[PDB]
Design a binder for these strands. Sequence first.
RNA 1: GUCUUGUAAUUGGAAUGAGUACAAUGUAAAUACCUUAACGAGGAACAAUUGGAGGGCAAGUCUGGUGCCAGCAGCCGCGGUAAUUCCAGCUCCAAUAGCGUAUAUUAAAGUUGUUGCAGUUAAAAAGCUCGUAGUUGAACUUUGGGCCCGGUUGGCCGGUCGGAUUUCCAACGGGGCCUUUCCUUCUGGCUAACCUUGAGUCCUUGUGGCUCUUGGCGAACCAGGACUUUUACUUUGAAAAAAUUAGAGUGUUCAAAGCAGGCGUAUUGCUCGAAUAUAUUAGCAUGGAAUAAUAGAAUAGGACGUUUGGUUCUAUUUUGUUGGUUUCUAGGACCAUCGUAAUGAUUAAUAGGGACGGUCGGGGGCAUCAGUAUUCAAUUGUCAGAGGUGAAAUUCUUGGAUUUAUUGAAGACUAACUACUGCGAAAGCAUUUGCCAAGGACGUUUUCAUUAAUCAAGAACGAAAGUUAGGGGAUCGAAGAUGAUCAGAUACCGUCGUAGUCUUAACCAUAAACUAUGCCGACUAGGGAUCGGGUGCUUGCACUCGGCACCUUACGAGAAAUCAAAGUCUUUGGGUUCU
Lengths: 129, 81, 144, 150
Amino acid sequence: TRSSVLADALNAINNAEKTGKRQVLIRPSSKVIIKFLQVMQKHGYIGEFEYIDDHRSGKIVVQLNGRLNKCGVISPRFNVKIGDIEKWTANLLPARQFGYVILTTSAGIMDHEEARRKHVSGKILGFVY
Amino acid sequence: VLVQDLLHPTAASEARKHKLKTLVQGPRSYFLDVKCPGCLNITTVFSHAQTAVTCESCSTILCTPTGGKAKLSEGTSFRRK
Amino acid sequence: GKGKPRGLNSARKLRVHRRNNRWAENNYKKRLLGTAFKSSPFGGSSHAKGIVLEKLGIESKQPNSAIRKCVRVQLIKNGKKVTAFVPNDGCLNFVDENDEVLLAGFGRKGKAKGDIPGVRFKVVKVSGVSLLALWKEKKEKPRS
Amino acid sequence: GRMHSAGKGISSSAIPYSRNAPAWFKLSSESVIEQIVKYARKGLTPSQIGVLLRDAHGVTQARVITGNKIMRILKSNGLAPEIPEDLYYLIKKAVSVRKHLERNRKDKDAKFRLILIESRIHRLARYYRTVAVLPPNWKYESATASALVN
RNA sequence: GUCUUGUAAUUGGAAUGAGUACAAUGUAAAUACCUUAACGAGGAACAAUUGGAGGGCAAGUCUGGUGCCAGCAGCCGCGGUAAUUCCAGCUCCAAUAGCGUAUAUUAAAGUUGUUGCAGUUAAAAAGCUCGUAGUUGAACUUUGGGCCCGGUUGGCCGGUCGGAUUUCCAACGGGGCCUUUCCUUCUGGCUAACCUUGAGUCCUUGUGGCUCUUGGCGAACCAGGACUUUUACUUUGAAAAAAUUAGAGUGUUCAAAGCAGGCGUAUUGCUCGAAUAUAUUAGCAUGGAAUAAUAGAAUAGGACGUUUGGUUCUAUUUUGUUGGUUUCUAGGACCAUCGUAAUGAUUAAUAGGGACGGUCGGGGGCAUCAGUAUUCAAUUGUCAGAGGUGAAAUUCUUGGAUUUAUUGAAGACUAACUACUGCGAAAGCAUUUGCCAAGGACGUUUUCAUUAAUCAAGAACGAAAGUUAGGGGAUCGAAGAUGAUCAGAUACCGUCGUAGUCUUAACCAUAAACUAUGCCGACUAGGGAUCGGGUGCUUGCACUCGGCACCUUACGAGAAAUCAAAGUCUUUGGGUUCU
Ligand SMILES: [K+]
Ligand SMILES: [Mg+2]
Ligand SMILES: [Mg+2]
Ligand SMILES: [Mg+2]
Ligand SMILES: [Mg+2]
Ligand SMILES: [Mg+2]
């Protein structure tokens, strides 16, 4: 059955960016999907997106801009000490210069740079580059 | 097609699509104001009927049910309300 | 998924599954059953002394042709009868019968070396002197 | 797709976007409740009711026009079945097939199909006991099944 | 012989501790270091070894020996008369006061795989489905906006290439307000303070501001009853002996070490040190409230309440004081009655279950219909062969075979139609018609509302053969008989034939039980066929959902064969079982 709505969203995004499309329908929507997408927007990996109220779970239509190599979940959402973000970034990201590991912290969903600054940690969620 | 408007599909294509596969799902069934010959008392009848709908006063058949959309009786007058 | 459980609370299955699958490894199975102690002539010791019972001329395996020079030994610790190779040219001359030999392994974790059928050991010393030393002619083979 | 089969069929209702609705329907909220309750006394199920109100009357969904779902309407008026509608119909089905097997022992398919039906019964009953609509020691017994349903 | 570099069993004066040894030093006494008189290198001596020289692997198709022997060789391989591999000599390589061997172990090993393997065909998807634990599980509940105040870095003039501050340019973080905004609640300590003003202008750009009186305004700050959904996770703190590990300082002559040491007027002394970090899982304290679970008001026994009664106990300074003892109180429980309130039920998942509708099907079971054939037997005519084969023989036959007609019985089987068609969990399922339940798909402005996915344990069903006991016993036919073939032929071929082949009641539990491809979910690409349902029509076509498949390409994937899944895997994580 459908287990990670976030996994399905990011999978759809990956498949479309590979085929050179400039837009994707996602379904369901969720708070966490939306929060994730906003982190992607803020660093300019996507364009606009548009939640479509259907009186159910919702649909999103993202606009893609070619800049995205790979988004992806991590599953399960491992707990991450502040110490051990450095290991997750070493494993997941192409370089030390760019790309973001994305965490749920009690402070909020956010990239790992923000989490360094704010001095917070929590659960790993996914990654983008 | 690489670049497409998913938010604004054409009404032609959105009619072709199945009732769940449209941008927002909704029913393509409708209601009818059916009128029998004998009595003029009007009845709301649903297009995909299932029940053999009898009028309360008259007591005659208005529509027999089928797979999908109910076949009405021969002598009737109908309109989408 | 990948055919293994990924869940955050799936540590038990992962640990237990891996335990069960480690029995398929060779070294692990030997280490835990205790094969080295239970079977195995030397009883999981690098070397063993024994008493020469015989001199054997073992015909080599194909496609080589030779008579490899070997000794049937009875180990002091167990009483286990064992065949050992006597290496280097004309070293079978030094051994004699009822002479105390120190045996070692051959190099292959208890497999037979080269072309010599059924021989997993070698002589290192005879009557408390090195076969190397006798064959380089440094020490002298004692009276007994 | 299906619980007890390879079938992956998507057939269902599509409820419309409109919650507060409709503009062509004139009968009041208090009027339709009477029509529901009238059919409840006459000895119909919540599903059977809602069919008649779709067909003969104009009621799209009772939850729209009335506010509450039909089961709540019956639950308030005190026409609640002792055991839920869906469970009832599964038990009914079991009793049918069980009764069939008594005469037909060599019907191996019926034996199989009886396992599946009774599995669904046990799964539902488990659900109801958790949410406390059946009492916590409720049990589907093949012996006392025909007694309960009919 | 130009600038110098090698090689000569060519010749020079120097240098030296290994050793031996005055004597000190050292020490409980010595020994040994450290120091040191005297004595102690010419290459034959004060003399370096251990393993190699085909490849892997750095170093010779150089000489002599042996001739598949002796021997080597971790592995691949060498050796049978030119041995690049054995035993030697020479020469050369490698590491070197060490180097080899054996066994164990770590890395190499993504060959144990959490990170991170593999399962169509290399080893490996359970015959099939059900199912408990386990693991996992759709969306939804304060979001945004306006403010204000301190912070931390770069600023901007770092101006002396090094450090400084004003306001401002910001970026990034933190707290408190307001916006339909729990910010536990009240009960005395204390009101500190600063819109309390008994002397106003003490005072850098009125945003870089005071000398205190009078209830104050107590979130600035302590102990009190009063009751407080419950976890997980994460921040900080604290803890987690020393040694060991990382690590700062320090010329032990260097270093491994050690925890010393270092500067004076070296004549009566001054001084820096012996840091710091890590070590979770558990417990403790603390901040956060995303993520993930959990509880709450639905037959209201619900919430708030200065109400308005009943009822139930509790006891303080008094009323002298113990004590008897009714009240007013003062705080609790508890049951009524009136009051306030927007009074209280999240979607309805292209999740799942249930109902309903017309259907579809070689799905199942129990009855019931035929069908021709095959063998045989009654009545038939006929006259020599008929059977069977690559060719023969075995066999049946003038008591009439075979062939031919007529009417029968028996058991089995269900042709042709019959397909890249259907149904079923799989095994399987095909003559007709009844009866019995079942089921998918489709249709649905019906219903419930997370009830689900996958599943150790445990269960149902499971071709054929095979087993036990009744029935049945046409045909074919293991065994067996039997004629050929053949060196043999108790094999293929040929003629018979037992069990078996069918059925009832029990068993058995397996197959290349195969798509050699677990199941559930999502996404990624063109095409036409076809099966079932539906819709539109201009009535045979299109659209649609659901199926069995198929064609092209390959985006991708793959060791390849190939694959629309075997794709979305080093850009490595959707869930889960098995191997
Ligand atoms: K080399
Ligand atoms: Mg589906
Ligand atoms: Mg299931
Ligand atoms: Mg492997
Ligand atoms: Mg099992
Ligand atoms: Mg098998």
